[PDB]
Nucleic acid binder design. Structure first.
Ligand SMILES: [Mg+2]
Lengths: 92, 95, 91
RNA sequence: AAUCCAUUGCACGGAU
RNA sequence: AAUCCAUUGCACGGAU
RNA sequence: AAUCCAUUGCACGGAU
């Protein structure tokens, strides 16, 4: 989805990277754009190669996506959209 | 030839998912690109040489420039948009 | 590196393109983002398929990276990062 | 309309 | 853990 | 010069 959101959806991630390293790496890269509330990574069948970065502010999310769109990350260009719906911690 | 990087009122988008029909492509493109400025037109055609392609015409060059810097590589119907500036002025702009 | 720098690092370049045409073609793409101080290309084994574009202003390098990330050059998407270290002409 | 073949194309095609 | 196979997936797998 | 093999490499090769 193209509708600005607090959360960015990243896919095409290198699946060899384990959750802890991926979370640390995504936080170091994306922290620059503003305060990150959380990064949700899962390694199960439907969730690998994927991350949700939840920014406190939409303006940080918009800036992260526009700057990091296509950035080569562990040999794969990041594909970044806005999450299709609000992440739970944002919804409350 | 190289990607065209000389700012222009019009951005040229290729590598569009060709399964998307004209009406929906224009409607989706408007929804995405209207956040960068006022859009005068969006030219889509589904002929052989025109498929996979759109011209989005902004009233001001500054909007084209923001649109290109922002939406480059956006995953749009599972294919990253490829954006340049239009080689030459659109007719709407020329008059 | 993901940190803005005066210098952009490009790889996944079509190794068939020769130095002069690669350098001329990179100026024609990237010069439109602001003044380029230098474009460094070598075709030696460790250096081929790569270029460093040194901009005068960091805003120019940032606009160039964001705007041309993944854009096909001689049938290959350009992979653009910021240089890990300042180019010598900058330092 | 749909499925398939082909098309990465800078403007103001073919098959069932 | 690792290795191989499969998976491009919008959330709060299989084999040694 | 051309072509083949190898190389995805963060700087200031082999081969006909
Ligand atoms: Mg078809």
């Amino acid at each position: 989805e193209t509708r600005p959101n607090h959360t960015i959806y990243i896919n095409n991630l290198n699946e060899k990277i384990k959750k802890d390293e991926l979370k640390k790496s995504l936080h170091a890269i994306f922290s620059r754009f503003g305060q990150i509330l959380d990064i949700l990574v899962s390694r199960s069948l439907k969730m690998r190669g994927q991350a949700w970065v939840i920014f406190k502010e939409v303006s940080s999310a918009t800036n992260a996506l526009r700057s990091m769109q296509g950035f080569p990350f562990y040999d794969k260009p990041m594909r970044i959209q806005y999450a299709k719906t609000d992440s739970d911690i944002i919804a409350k």
